[PDB]
Amino acid sequence: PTYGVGHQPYRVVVLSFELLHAPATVCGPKKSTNLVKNKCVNFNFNGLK
């Protein structure tokens, strides 16, 4: 504990993204909103718009 900040331990985590011919598997989330009816609304239903 008596050492300075320069000599203090630091935990380091390294992430490494890569792209291949795979169909993409591990990517992030998609959020959704409420559902409205009987109104003229542009929509994006699972890729159909």
Partner: protein, 47 residues
């Protein structure tokens, strides 16, 4: 894809004369190389 129908009579000569629609059951997302096919059988012992 898969379906099933009965035939009653075996007649091990040819496939039945009938139309059938082949409904999907499952989809698989792994894209590994496939070039050859092999099958299995259920054989336990002489009986």
């Amino acid at each position: 894809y898969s379906k099933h129908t009965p035939i009653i009579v075996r007649e091990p000569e040819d496939l039945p004369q009938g139309f059938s629609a082949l409904e999907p059951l499952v989809d698989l997302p792994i894209g590994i190389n496939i070039t050859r096919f092999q099958t299995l059988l259920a054989l336990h012992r002489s009986y």
